[PDB]
Every structure is written in structure tokens, then in C-alpha cells.
Design an enzyme around this catalytic site. Sequence first.
Site, PDB file in Angstrom:
ATOM      1  CG  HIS A 283      -0.357   0.411   2.510  1.00  0.00           C
ATOM      2  ND1 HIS A 283      -0.120   1.725   2.859  1.00  0.00           N
ATOM      3  CD2 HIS A 283       0.013  -0.333   3.580  1.00  0.00           C
ATOM      4  CE1 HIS A 283       0.394   1.769   4.075  1.00  0.00           C
ATOM      5  NE2 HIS A 283       0.482   0.534   4.537  1.00  0.00           N
ATOM      6  CB  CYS A 284       1.273   4.327  -1.642  1.00  0.00           C
ATOM      7  SG  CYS A 284       0.334   4.042  -3.172  1.00  0.00           S
ATOM      8  CE  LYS A 285      -4.273  10.765   0.995  1.00  0.00           C
ATOM      9  NZ  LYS A 285      -4.577  10.429   2.411  1.00  0.00           N
ATOM     10  CB  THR A 291       0.924   0.547  -4.663  1.00  0.00           C
ATOM     11  OG1 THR A 291       0.845   0.988  -3.300  1.00  0.00           O
ATOM     12  CG2 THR A 291       0.615  -0.950  -4.737  1.00  0.00           C
TER      13      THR A 291
END
Lengths: 369, 368
Positions: A283-285, A291
Site C-alpha cells: 500500500h501507499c496512500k 504501489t
Amino acid sequence: ENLYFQGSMNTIEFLRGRVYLGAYDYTPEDTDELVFFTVEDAIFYNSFHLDFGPMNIGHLYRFAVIFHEILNDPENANKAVVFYSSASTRQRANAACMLCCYMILVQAWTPHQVLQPLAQVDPPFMPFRDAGYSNADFEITIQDVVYGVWRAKEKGLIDLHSFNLESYEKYEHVEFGDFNVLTPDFIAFASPQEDHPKGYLATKSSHLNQPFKSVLNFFANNNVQLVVRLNSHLYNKKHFEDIGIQHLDLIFEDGTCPDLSIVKNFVGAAETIIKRGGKIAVHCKAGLGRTGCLIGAHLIYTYGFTANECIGFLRFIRPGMVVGPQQHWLYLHQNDFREWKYTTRISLKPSEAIGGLYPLISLEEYRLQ
Amino acid sequence: IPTTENLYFQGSMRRSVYLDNTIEFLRGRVYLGAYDYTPEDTDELVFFTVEDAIFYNSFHLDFGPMNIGHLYRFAVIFHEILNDPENANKAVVFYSSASTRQRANAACMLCCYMILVQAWTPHQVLQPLAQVDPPFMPFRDAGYSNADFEITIQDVVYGVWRAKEKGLIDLHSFNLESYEKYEHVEFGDFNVLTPDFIAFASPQEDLNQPFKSVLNFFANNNVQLVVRLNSHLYNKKHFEDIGIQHLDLIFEDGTCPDLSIVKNFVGAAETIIKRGGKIAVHCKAGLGRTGCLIGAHLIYTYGFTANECIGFLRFIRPGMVVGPQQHWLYLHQNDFREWKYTTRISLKPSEAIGGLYPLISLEEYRLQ
């Protein structure tokens, strides 16, 4: 054989007298020779910003069910089927690409077979753009998406026969975690966000929100062995570690491209987990840009995708992956990723930078060890 | 190409202009329009088109992109307009007619100009063009079958930019008169593609003027190997008579070569290049089969994508890589790239390539 041996004895021919692709800003009348259908009102793309497509694998699955019902209707046994969209260049691109993906995934057509009907159409289809907020400066085409989806199928990454539409549509929702299983090895998801939806005095209730609970439970039930976090902290990683899942930070800033040292660490970490049969959830934000950079690099390293194919395949499963300048970055480093298969090896000693997993190391060093 | 105002550096803060059917490349200075009429110059705007003077010469249904000779001539015209004192405070609007094919050619030529003359990067020239409605017509091949493979302006821009970065294009030393002369049928129908490669049409012998022209140029420009890919239309002795090695690697018209043939070609080319010579390759037209082999070497050497390689080849010699050869180059590009790691040049000569050194696995190389 309802497809290849039946039919009628601003429209594109895919199978003579049986399958056509049209574009109409009205509703054409069915005849004794023609049956027309569109799916645009029920099957539609949800834009992040100015992205408009391509349609995703769930869209395609639902289209295939509808298409097959029309083909299998005895009423249509001697009719040409005209799948159609409205007449905008964006909607035509979506319809054409979805029909191509249908032929690739359901009917085992090859890329040049599905692209021949679409070549040099006037007006041209609108190329696909990213989901970011900056002005577009990189496009992928139906040719890119078709080749990417075809290569993914050839590598066993797409299998419409085992595709679970209910699970796909459930977990794409924000309230169930906003994630997609991309391949048998990778999950992309949005960062969990720790909050306190029941207040601070509900001592016998979890303070985890529903999407966080959903992510933890799915991960525990589906052999996720490593979670990789690429954005600033929005939750306490203990919730993953307490459930038996290794947690790794490889954080870089929103919308930017990772240093190759981060990519090398990620590929080695992922290789270690895959060798154990586990899944990696990244995950990123949003689980889209950063990602897509890391998972996309690993897909290119493993399977030989072009960068355009890799972006097209990722977006076919999870719309919006790889954002802004990350597209040019993947495009320019794809040779680097692919040729690490020859210029690197999995180190024999563990690295603290990836929590005891094994990094990618130069060929001269694997010689030493 | 005359010197002109430098559009790389930040330059002068100029006010934006706004016109319909017009894309902005450089605020207040460079615009790209599409009109089915002839617009009138204002006191703030000067329009120009080159559709009346710079012609793409189609083989069949191919329509572009415009080639490097076209681009060179466009640059001279463009700089003339930019350097005119009467235009010092105007926006220049380069324009085409409104067809999607002519707009594609104009946009791609302006992008290639910014890449090659003004040192812009791909994302800089592509941002003005992204998501334009209606879209540009993608470029198709020059063959007679129905199109099934397209390359885009993005492909051409990236291939031309990579070629420039690798030193394969240099407009400062580009000789327009030589370029235009030798692509004529009567002078041999060839192009120097890179410092290492010439692609040409097969000479024909019942010597006629194009054969003599080819022999004269090859003798004076360090061609050291001619590779023939089609059936014999001339006597190879005439090349050997001027000391140039001749090699047959013939495979069928309109088809794709076995990888063993490609590996042999790459080893032959590497041997010649290492000795400092050029390789001249022909099939019947010098487009299809020729593009397969030279394209494979360019990918092997420089890491072009297949689409970039096709775009760059056609930018120098329109029509290269025909029909199913496009999909073939696309599907095997990883193979050509991986050979840099899984093979070396043999130390033993091979008579299948006339005594040159072929590609062999790291294994057979170890024994040697």
C-alpha cells in the site's frame, strides 16, 4: 459454435455476420437480421480525475455474461450481434478495448486477431490517460492493454474461470479495504487509517474501523506474509504483526518515483516471500501510484512485460495504478528491471533493511558468498 | 539550419494566446493549429503550413510519420519565420489541414523538431498533445495487408529521442542533399540509418545507374559487408570486385526470420562494427525483412523498445518493418536484449556467415 457457425448471412466487423462493434448516439432498432446491445448505463468506469478507462476485469466479466445471454438466445440464432457504445472517442475506446479483452480472455484470440478490426478507425479511439491531477503527458493504447492482458493470461495471472466477481466487487469498496488481488503473489490496497469511531471509552470494542478489520481478516485468511508500506504512517503496524504478518516500511513521497535501491530491496523481499509460497500486500496512500511502481517493477522483472503492457494490465485489475511521472519512470527503467534477472541474484545473507528477507545483490557478490 | 532564438532556456516571459483548434507548445510563441482554411496573419499571430511543399510519399496506406529530411526542411522554414524581424512580437502557429492523418504528421514533426533542435525531453513535447480531441491517427505500416499494429507519436518521439541520446542522429552533421539524392530509385534507393548501418533496395542486373551509384557510395563510405535477404537479382561479384564482403541470409518475402538467422546476423554485424566498418542490408525493397534484422541489432545494442525502434527506423527510412514483422519484433524484443547477457561473440569463425564470428552461449564460450 453459437459464435463461429451462426449469424446473419459506423460499425466494425469482428466475426462476419455475427459480431460487430458500433457507435450510436441513439438506440438502433433490432431487426430480423440485427440485434443491438449496449452496457453503458449499467457497466461504467468510475473516474478518479480525468481517467476514463479502460474497463476493468469485473466490468469485463459482467459484459461476458450479458454477451453470452444474447448469443445463446434462440431468438438470435440467425442474427448479427452489434455491441455498441455512445459516439464519444472515450466511450468508443472503452467499448472496443473491452470487446478485445473479451476475445483474448474468453475466446483465446491473439492480439493481432483482435487489433486488426480496430486499426486505423476514423475517428481514432481516445488513448488512455492516468488518474493523477497533473496534465496528461503519457498515454497507453488499446494495443498496450490487449498485449498486457494477453501476456498476463499466458503467464497464468488471469483466469476468468476462477474469477470471483462477488469478492472482486466487495473489496474494491472503500468500506471493505479498497484492495485488489492483482496476481497470485500480490495485493494492492489503500493505506488503512487508524481512528476511533466508537470513541475512547468503549473498552470492550475494537477501535479498528470496518475497512481495517476487513483488510486484516482477508490477509490472515489468504496467506499474506508481508505488508509493505510506502506512505507516511496512518496506522500502527502492530495490528499486522500481532496477526502474524511481517510489516516493512519502504516509504517515499506521494507522487514521486522510488530510488532503484528501494526497488531492489522490494524485489528481493518479494522474491523471498514468493519462494515461501506467501503473498505480498503493498500500500501507499491510495494503493495506486507508488504501489504500482514497485509491483510493476516486479512484474516486469518476473514476466517480461513492457512498461505499457504492465500499466495496462495493472489498470485492468485495479484502475488508476501508476500515476503521473511514474509512468515515464517505469517506461524508462523497464530494461533495468527485466535485466536484473541476469545482473543480480538473491543474496544468501539476510538484510536488516528488509527485516531479515534477502535482497537483490550484484552478480560478483553472489559469486563471493 | 540557421541559428534562431533558443527555446530550451527559460527565455522571455510572454503572454499566452488563445485560439480554437490550437495547442500551445510554448506560451506566447509556438502553437500548433488545424484548419481547413487559410488563416490570416494578424499583428500578434503568424501562421504557416508546409503541406504545400513537404510531401510524405506513401507506399500504400502508410501516411507518416514525416522523415528526417522533411524535418530538416521544416526546421529551416520554421527558423526563417522565427528570425524575421516582422514576427518578433507574434506567436507562430504551425498548422495542418484538419484530417487526423495530417494532424498526426504535423504534431509528430513539431515534436521531433523540439527533441532534435531544441533539446526538449519526451514528456515536454508530449504533454501538449495528450488527450487531444479528436485524437491523432496512429501510424500504420507500408504493407498491403490490413493494418493490425500501430505506433504512436509517443513511440516515435521516444525512439527519436533515444536515438539522439545514443548519438545516432546529429542534425549538425546531417547532409540533406545526400539524404534526398540517394533515396531516389535511380541513385540506389538507400538510406544511411546509423553510423553502422545502411538499408537499401536490392540492385538489379539483367551495370545500370542505380547499381553504379550504390557501388560508388559503398566504396567511398566504408561499407565492409553487404547482406542480401531476398532472391538473387544481381551478381554479387560486383561487390566483391570492390573489396566488400557479400553474405546471403535469404528468407522468404513477407515473412519473419528464424532466431538462428538473427543471431548470425547480429554476430556478423558485431564483427564488422568492431573492425570499424558499416553493414549494408537489402531485401527486395529494403524495408521489411531488412528492418527485422537491423531492428534486432538496434534493440540488442541500444535498448530501444520495439515500437521505438520501428518509429526511429521509419523516421530515417519510411516503410521499414512490414505487416507481421511488426508483431514479430514486438514479441521478440526481450530476446534481442537478453542476448547481451546470455551470449558472447565467438572466437572461432563460422562459414555460415562467411568467416565472421557468430553469437554463442556463455557455455560454448567457456570451453573455447
